[PDB]
Scaffold this motif. Structure first.
Motif, mmCIF file in Angstrom:
data_model
loop_
_atom_site.group_PDB
_atom_site.id
_atom_site.type_symbol
_atom_site.label_atom_id
_atom_site.label_comp_id
_atom_site.label_asym_id
_atom_site.label_seq_id
_atom_site.Cartn_x
_atom_site.Cartn_y
_atom_site.Cartn_z
ATOM 1 N N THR D 448 -1.560 14.846 -19.119
ATOM 2 C CA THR D 448 -2.390 16.043 -19.050
ATOM 3 C C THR D 448 -1.785 17.172 -19.876
ATOM 4 O OG1 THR D 448 -3.438 15.548 -16.926
ATOM 5 C CG2 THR D 448 -3.169 17.868 -17.509
ATOM 6 N N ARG D 451 -2.223 16.448 -23.529
ATOM 7 C CA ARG D 451 -3.652 16.544 -23.807
ATOM 8 C C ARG D 451 -4.092 18.002 -23.960
ATOM 9 N NH1 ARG D 451 -6.997 14.942 -20.153
ATOM 10 N NH2 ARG D 451 -5.539 13.797 -18.813
ATOM 11 N N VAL D 452 -3.622 18.884 -23.073
ATOM 12 C CA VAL D 452 -3.911 20.312 -23.211
ATOM 13 C C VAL D 452 -3.207 20.896 -24.434
ATOM 14 C CG1 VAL D 452 -3.818 22.551 -22.077
ATOM 15 C CG2 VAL D 452 -4.268 20.508 -20.734
ATOM 16 N N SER D 455 -5.237 20.002 -27.362
ATOM 17 C CA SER D 455 -6.428 20.843 -27.383
ATOM 18 C C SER D 455 -6.123 22.235 -27.924
ATOM 19 C CB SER D 455 -7.033 20.940 -25.984
ATOM 20 O OG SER D 455 -8.219 21.715 -25.995
ATOM 21 N N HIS D 456 -4.931 22.761 -27.636
ATOM 22 C CA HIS D 456 -4.522 24.045 -28.203
ATOM 23 C C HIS D 456 -4.168 23.930 -29.683
ATOM 24 C CE1 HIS D 456 -4.153 25.769 -24.086
ATOM 25 N NE2 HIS D 456 -4.293 26.913 -24.732
ATOM 26 N N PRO D 459 -7.360 23.483 -32.994
ATOM 27 C CA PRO D 459 -7.932 24.653 -33.683
ATOM 28 C C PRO D 459 -6.964 25.346 -34.624
ATOM 29 C CG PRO D 459 -7.664 24.968 -31.299
ATOM 30 C CD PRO D 459 -7.744 23.519 -31.577
ATOM 31 N N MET D 460 -5.677 25.401 -34.277
ATOM 32 C CA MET D 460 -4.700 26.153 -35.054
ATOM 33 C C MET D 460 -4.325 25.482 -36.368
ATOM 34 S SD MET D 460 -1.925 27.892 -32.484
ATOM 35 C CE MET D 460 -2.704 28.471 -30.980
#
Lengths: 314, 452, 297, 516
Positions: D448, D451-452, D455-456, D459-460
């Motif tokens: 988890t 995975r987070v 996800s952060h 985009p960067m």
RNA sequence: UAAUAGAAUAAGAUAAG
RNA sequence: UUUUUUUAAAUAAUUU
């Protein structure tokens, strides 16, 4: 239940539900094997049993603690922003919302910090246990008196147990603590030596209270309830006034004749009475002993959340 | 601790509060912080607005009422110096003053509400959520301020400027205020959609609970929440399963394919359920209306083991749920009645009447419970509805209670609300029972009003 | 460095912008969200502020209100933007909220017939370049020279007048500086003319000139704090290749709808440099931007 | 020992039986503070009675500072006391002196009240014409200290004061200049005219006038650099015999205005370092920062100033440890002895440092070689784990980067830092990177969490350069990320620069191009 | 008789109308 | 995903 995240640190609505004592004044209570430091000399106990009262040799609280405890009293008689947990008191002088020259409060140990802590103070509770023949000490109730400046009245001669007739055995003690420096001109106690063994340990008839009269007549009402022999021992040993410091305490027998002087100083005077009772104390009727309290039946042993055990010599 | 300045005292008090509320409620820290705060004064020293706000918040958090010296000094500072309380320290002051109910607290809350209403256009992601949560703590009805904050929240959420914690805080704060806005909650749900995997199990259940509590009556998002949570059941804790049951009982729509999985997971974790979880599950099943004896047997057997852990709310809800379903558990009912008699003074206005009515509805009479709750009933009469007064009176009559000191308050309350007392059709039968026991002799005016 | 932007008003977005080109409002909103995220991901900006929506689509051009010349926040004359006047007010409160200046200089407003448009001013190293086109009269040029032009050995500030034709866009839209030496300009008539003029007015100076495709909007924060972030439009790959080969960091930004509405990236942002007043002889801490303990390792 | 008369006097004082006025209380407190023969401060029951008399007395007769002194001498003995707030004058009582007295009491006794300030300003608006020239300056000073926001009234007062230029002296001019500079909202025209006034009468200035003018110029900013110019030249003929604090203020002004004439800066710095031994802790710290910001720390310069700062390094303020640590870095000079005692001092006060200061200290000490073999890394790790609840994104990034650079290994702390940073999303790659560096030390994290983190990250990746792409790929492979979106985004970003799979391309980049 | 200042920081379920 | 925002407003009625 679920205590909200911003309400997890709160306290019960009334401080009766707080089992034990908070750490505010003197921290936490000492350990089971650390209660022997506050023992008093046997001569103090003998003096109490001889005179009917005794002044403890050492002040019980530091000056900062006395200042905080006097701030609690000052905020218990606001009359503008009335005290929170005011409904948690047995009685109040501001129930009429006007007050007067004398402020009296009862059951304040359920309303404010420090006052709840003062009940579990080892210095006075160990001495009360020694007075009560080394038994369990249970709080009876509290009382706070505050007399205004230049106009404070005086409480005439009275016996404490005369107000506690619904408790069967005489097994009580009073601890009076001065929250301000007192003298014959501002609220000093006036007790009759050897007055707790007069009527075979009985109760004198109640005195006649006529307000709006000078202090001299109020204190001179003694000559109306005594008999000839009590007059003789009053001639031999006249009533004596005890000067108290900013923290000095005084043990008083329930049957000792007792009065408080008026206030003629330039500032208000404050004092706190705490009543203690032993393990073997019973009731005489069916019903509660105090307003909105647990009700007992016949000769029922007095116990409950309203009368916590503050010391156990076992 | 004497060498520590008040600016350090505020920081250490905040540290203690943060450790206390989240990392376990250790009484050691609570009493140490109370002792430290009991001997602090903002006098003779120049302090920042943030330091005073932190001191006030940490003092109030630890049970310190409005009569305290530190609380009074902090409240006075805020009133005299108001502009110094910027939007950064406004939520701290509002949260501190929320539980404080006094004249100065009311004035401070109103002034900060007006300040937040004026500056609602200039806040950022942190400030909007902090302010709305702080105002959700206090009970206020400044709709205009809430509408402005909702407009700002929508504007910030359009560009995607909220994390999962921000979303759950916003949803809980707005559902607590009963502020029903279809578009604000739609934007919050769409922000959760866009966040996708950044919303974990621990951060998804409270969102569903907050969305269910507000009651938007939208079936388009309840199905979506059910579908999204159907994959997270295997990871869910018992406290999360109970909250899921309660939330989807709040929604009111039947999802059998989800309730079956939830029931299986609850059966798997039957050894971990406390009294609160059992009461919540039973109340949720009562509200939603499903009758599942198979789970009910396990729940009752578990509740028989944690009887001493039951609170007054838990006792009331469990007894009411068991009475509604017609489930007979003599041992559990006896133990619960004895426990309720033990803690009769903890019952609130609704809990006492609910427990009495639930015990009286079933043919279960216990003098230990009956005497205790009848005596306690005096202090709650003044806080009851007409229907609640009728229910309490019927339950008291089923207990065969004739003491005037108990009956006078309830008869006064039902006389003061006589129009609503006699205007409820569903209680009509109860009425003809109440007067069948007491008779016309008891409280003649109520009998005459009943005749008309 | 605080960057101020305003959210679009979805209800009142025009169905077709200038020249009759149709636009799509949903893609405009999506591109604005992407632009906001790209601005936040920039390391140089301290904060990005989002003002509330306003009914007019013209309100998105936030940079039109004022210009930053050195330490002076000069407010443009309110001559052709009366209908935006109140809007400017709502923008100043935001600047006051973030701890910025109490008010802007009104030097240009007080002068008569002083037409100036923010965006014709380019902050070259040790001076500014102004455009003597339709948007700016000679009176504004004279006032700016009277105010900010100083000739000294070390306290030198230069105001360069760059003439441009009537059809030219604002100078800031096709002329700028990047890094500490790079010059960004369009390979158009106006860009080449401006570059030649600036070479003529500043001789004996070595610098790099980078030519982008015409119509490729760019945005580069040039100032005291060095940076290599040059935002560019997504469609033009060769401009990105040139900027990368010049030793910079191109950040492609989708800018279709705003371009088809005539708004550029430069005009859609308000970059202001804020400081904190130091009471007494007190210095304020500054964030680090270089390597530490180089000598050791 | 108290004889009978002294004992009875003390008893009468203790029992509140004597009516004391404010003057008598002030005399008794002054006597107690001067002579301690009677032990007045050693009797709590006597000082408490004196305080009780103080509360019930008329304190308006004495000056505000006399009441403040009584309150201070009661606080020193342990009594919580505060002088009473003065009421706003009403009806015939409104006079300039009575209205100035309210502000003076609010200043001295620290009882600031915005409402009474506003009422006093509204009462003083109509009668502003009756003020004497000195009372106007007194009002300006009192309003400047109280941090009043009514810049319009202060501007009116400044205009009235400046109308009387001939009457005012140099000290009054300097005080008005600094008070106006402290007020935030003053219109720049008034400041320009006041600075023009200050520009003349330049030679009449005394060292205190120089200090006040330098403080005003520091507060104002670079826009008044021209005025600062007239300072420097005016100070060129007196630099060889000047006060150390004046030279420190000069250096601070040089740093603030970004002065261009290097000859004057060198002259002032060379004159400063001669008397740098006479500076206090704060002044020495500010001078050390100013010398660094002007690129003037040569070998002799740094050695001489470090020899002076070592004296205060033993009992340094927590607010001063981080600055000198910053100056110690970024320079190619030997500062081992200074850093040793600074690190020891930071160790001593580890339980009082705020989150920001702890994060800053860890950030500077992250890349310091001799800081790894120190107890400070472990002590600061425990302190940071305790203080993670009070840390913002910048403090989180600084502390995590400093601990990761120091080799501190603690999986629980890094996991807690990642969870704390998940509460408020990472705005920048510089904020997010320290979490990755900390989590890559152990090499394992829950799926988890990775995975987070992916996800952060994804985009960067549209703005990071090639070096950042390589570092992010290294951290992602170390943590074990199996998501395809993040690798696709990073490979797409790489293709922009390379555009092709070069044969020489680092083997690590080819694996990225396969989008593993 | 009495006047010198520094810090920038986000926890999260009340049996509803 | 496209709903909506920006006054100084002061005119009820009663023996409570």
């Amino acid at each position: 239940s679920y205590v909200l995240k911003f309400l997890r640190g709160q306290l019960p609505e009334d401080l009766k539900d707080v089992n034990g004592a908070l750490g505010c004044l003197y921290g936490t209570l000492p350990d089971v094997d650390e209660f022997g430091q506050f023992v008093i000399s046997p001569d103090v106990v003998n003096s109490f049993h001889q005179f009917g009262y005794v002044k403890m040799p050492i002040p019980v609280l530091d000056h900062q603690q006395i200042d905080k405890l006097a701030d609690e009293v000052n905020e218990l008689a606001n009359n503008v922003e009335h005290h929170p947990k005011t409904e948690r008191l047995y009685a109040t002088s501001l129930a009429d919302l006007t007050g007067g020259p004398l402020f009296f409060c009862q059951g304040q140990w359920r309303a404010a910090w420090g006052m709840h802590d003062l009940i579990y103070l080892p210095t006075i509770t160990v001495a009360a246990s020694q007075i009560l023949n080394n038994s369990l000490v249970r709080l009876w109730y509290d009382e706070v008196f505050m007399k205004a400046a230049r106009t404070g009245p005086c409480v005439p001669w009275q016996q404490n147990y005369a107000r506690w007739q619904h408790t069967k055995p005489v097994n009580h003690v009073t601890v009076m603590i001065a929250l301000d420096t007192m003298n014959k001109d501002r609220g000093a106690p006036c007790l009759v030596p050897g007055s707790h063994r007069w009527r075979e340990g009985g109760l004198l008839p109640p005195v006649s209270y006529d307000p709006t009269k000078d202090e001299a007549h109020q204190l001179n009402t003694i000559w109306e309830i005594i008999n000839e022999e009590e007059g003789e021992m009053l001639m031999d040993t006249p009533p004596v006034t005890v000067d108290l410091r900013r923290g000095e305490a005084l043990l008083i027998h329930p049957l000792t004749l007792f009065a408080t002087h008026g206030n003629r100083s330039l500032d208000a005077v404050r004092c706190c009475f705490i009543h203690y009772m032993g393990e073997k104390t019973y009731a005489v009727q069916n019903g509660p002993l105090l307003p909105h309290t647990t009700k007992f039946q016949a000769d029922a042993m007095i116990q409950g959340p309203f009368y916590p055990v503050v010391f156990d010599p076992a | 601790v004497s060498h520590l300045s008040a600016r350090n005292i505020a920081t250490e008090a905040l540290q203690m509060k943060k450790l206390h509320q989240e990392r376990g409620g250790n009484p050691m820290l609570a009493q140490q912080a109370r002792r430290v705060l009991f001997a602090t004064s903002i006098a003779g020293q120049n302090l920042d607005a943030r330091s005073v706000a932190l001191l006030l918040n940490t003092a109030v958090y630890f049970g310190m009422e409005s009569d305290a010296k530190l609380v009074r000094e902090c409240i006075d500072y805020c009133l005299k110096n108001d502009k110094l309380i910027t939007v950064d320290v406004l939520p701290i002051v509002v949260t501190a003053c929320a539980t404080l109910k006094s004249r100065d607290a009311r004035e401070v809350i109103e002034m900060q509400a007006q300040k937040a209403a004026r500056n609602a256009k200039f806040l950022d992601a942190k400030d909007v959520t902090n302010i709305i949560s702080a105002f959700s703590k206090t009970g206020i009805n400044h709709e205009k301020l809430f509408a402005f904050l909702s407009r700002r929240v929508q504007t910030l959420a359009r560009v995607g400027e909220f994390e999962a914690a921000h979303l759950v805080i916003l949803a809980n704060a707005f559902s607590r205020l009963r502020y029903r806005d279809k578009f604000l909650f739609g934007a919050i749900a769409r922000r959760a959609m866009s966040l996708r995997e950044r919303v974990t199990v621990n951060e998804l259940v409270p969102l569903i609970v907050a969305f269910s509590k507000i009651g938007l009556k939208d079936p388009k998002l309840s199905k979506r929440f059910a579908t999204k949570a159907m994959e997270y059941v295997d990871q869910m804790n018992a406290e999360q399963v109970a909250s899921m049951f309660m939330a989807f009982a709040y929604f009111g729509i039947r999802y059998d394919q989800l309730f079956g999985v939830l029931t299986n997971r609850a059966v798997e974790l039957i050894d971990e359920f406390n009294a609160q979880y059992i009461s919540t599950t039973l109340n949720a099943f009562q509200r939603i209306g499903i009758n599942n004896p198979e789970l009910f047997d396990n729940l009752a057997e578990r509740a028989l083991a944690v009887v001493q852990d039951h609170d007054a709310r838990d006792i009331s809800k469990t007894v009411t749920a068991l009475a509604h379903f017609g489930l007979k558990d003599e041992e559990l009912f006896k133990r619960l009645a004895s426990h309720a008699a033990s803690i009769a003074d903890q019952f609130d206005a609704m809990g006492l009447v609910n427990t009495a009515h639930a015990f009286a509805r079933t043919n279960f009479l216990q003098q230990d419970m009956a005497v205790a709750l009848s005596e306690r009933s005096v202090y709650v009469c003044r806080l009851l509805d007409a229907g609640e007064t009728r229910r309490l009176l019927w339950a008291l009559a089923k207990f065969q209670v004739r003491d005037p000191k108990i009956l006078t308050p309830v008869f006064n309350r039902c006389l003061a609300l006589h129009y609503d007392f006699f205007a409820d059709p569903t209680g009509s039968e109860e009425i003809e029972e109440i007067f069948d026991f007491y008779g016309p002799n008891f409280c003649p005016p109520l009998y005459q009003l009943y005749i008309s | 460095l605080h960057a101020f932007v305003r959210s679009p008003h979805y209800r009142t977005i025009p169905s077709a912008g200038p020249n009759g080109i149709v636009v799509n409002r949903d893609m405009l909103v999506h591109q604005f969200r992407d632009f906001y995220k790209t601005l936040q991901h920039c390391s140089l900006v301290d904060k990005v502020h989002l003002m509330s929506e306003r009914p007019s689509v013209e309100a998105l051009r936030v940079a039109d209100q004022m210009v930053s010349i050195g330490a002076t926040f000069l407010e443009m004359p309110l001559t052709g933007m009366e209908h935006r006047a109140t809007e400017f007010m709502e923008s100043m409160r935001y600047v006051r909220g973030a701890g910025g200046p109490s008010t802007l200089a009104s030097y240009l407003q007080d002068t008569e017939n002083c037409r100036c448009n923010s965006g014709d001013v380019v902050c070259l190293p040790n001076g500014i370049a102004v455009g003597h086109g339709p948007r700016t009269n000679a009176v504004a040029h004279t006032t700016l020279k009277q105010l900010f032009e100083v000739k000294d050995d070390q306290f030198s500030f230069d105001v360069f007048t760059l003439e441009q034709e009537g059809d030219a866009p604002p100078l800031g839209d096709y002329f700028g500086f990047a890094g500490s030496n790079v010059l960004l300009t369009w390979k158009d008539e106006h860009g080449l003319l401006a570059v030649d003029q600036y070479q003529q007015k500043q001789p004996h100076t070595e610098m790099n000139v980078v030519y982008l495709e015409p119509g490729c909007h760019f945005l580069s924060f040039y100032g005291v704090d060095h940076t290599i972030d040059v935002l560019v439009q997504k469609g033009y790959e060769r401009s990105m290749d040139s900027i990368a080969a010049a030793g910079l960091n191109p950040i492609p930004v989708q800018w279709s709808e705003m371009d088809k509405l005539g708004i550029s990236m430069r005009a859609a942002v308000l970059p202001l440099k804020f400081f904190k007043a130091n009471v007494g002889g007190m210095l304020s801490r500054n964030k680090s931007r270089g390597a530490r303990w180089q000598t050791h390792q | 020992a108290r004889p009978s008369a002294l004992h009875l006097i003390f008893e009468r004082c203790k029992l509140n039986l004597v009516e004391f006025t404010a003057q008598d209380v002030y005399q008794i407190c002054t006597t107690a503070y001067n002579m301690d023969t009677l032990g007045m401060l050693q009797d709590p029951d006597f000082m408490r009675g004196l305080h009780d008399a103080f509360r019930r007395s008329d304190q308006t007769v004495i000056s505000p500072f006399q009441a403040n002194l009584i309150a201070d001498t009661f606080r020193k003995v342990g009594i919580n006391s505060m002088p009473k707030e003065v009421s706003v004058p009403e009806e015939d009582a409104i006079s300039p002196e009575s209205l100035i007295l309210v502000l003076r009491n609010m200043n001295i006794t620290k009882q600031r009240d915005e409402r009474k300030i506003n009422e006093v300003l509204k009462l003083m608006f109509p009668i502003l014409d009756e003020f004497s020239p000195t009372q106007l300056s007194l009002t300006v000073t009192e309003l400047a200290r109280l941090k009043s926001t009514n810049a319009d009234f202060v501007g009116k007062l400044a205009k009235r004061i400046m109308e009387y230029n001939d009457d005012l002296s140099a000290l009054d001019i300097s005080s008005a200049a600094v008070s106006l500079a402290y007020c935030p909202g003053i219109s720049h025209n008034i400041l320009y005219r006041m600075m023009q006034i200050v520009e003349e009468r330049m030679g009449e200035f005394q060292p205190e006038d120089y200090i006040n003018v330098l403080h005003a110029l520091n507060t104002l900013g670079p826009k008044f650099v021209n005025t600062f110019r007239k300072i420097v030249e005016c100070g060129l003929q007196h630099v060889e015999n000047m006060d150390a604090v004046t030279l420190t203020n000069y250096m601070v002004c040089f740093s603030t205005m970004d002065y261009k004439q290097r000859e004057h800066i060198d002259i002032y710095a060379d004159a400063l370092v001669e008397v740098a031994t006479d500076l206090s802790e704060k002044d020495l710290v500010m001078a050390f920062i100013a010398l660094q910001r002007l690129r003037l720390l040569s070998d002799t310069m740094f050695g001489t100033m470090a020899s002076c700062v070592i004296r205060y390094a033993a009992k340094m303020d927590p607010r001063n440890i981080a600055p000198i640590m910053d100056i110690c870095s970024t320079v190619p000079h030997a500062s081992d002895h200074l850093m040793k005692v600074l690190m020891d001092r930071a160790v001593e006060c580890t339980r009082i440092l705020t989150a920001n200061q702890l994060g800053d200290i860890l950030d500077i000490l992250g890349l310091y070689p001799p800081a790894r073999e120190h107890p400070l890394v472990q002590l600061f790790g425990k302190q940071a784990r305790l203080r993670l609840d009070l840390m913002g994104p910048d403090a989180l990034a600084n502390a995590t980067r400093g601990l990761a650079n120091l080799g501190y290994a603690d999986p629980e702390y890094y996991a807690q830092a990642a969870e704390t940073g998940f509460r408020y999303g990472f705005k920048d790659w510089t904020l997010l990177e320290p979490m990755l560096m900390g989590l890559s030390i152990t090499g394992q994290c829950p799926p988890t969490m990775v995975r987070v983190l992916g996800s952060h990250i994804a985009p960067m990746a549209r703005s990071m350069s090639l070096m950042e792409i390589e570092r992010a790929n290294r951290y992602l492979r170390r943590l074990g990320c199996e998501d395809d979106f993040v690798y696709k985004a990073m490979a797409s970003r790489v293709l922009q620069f390379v555009k092709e799979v070069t044969p020489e391309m680092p083997e690590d980049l080819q694996v990225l191009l396969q989008r593993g």
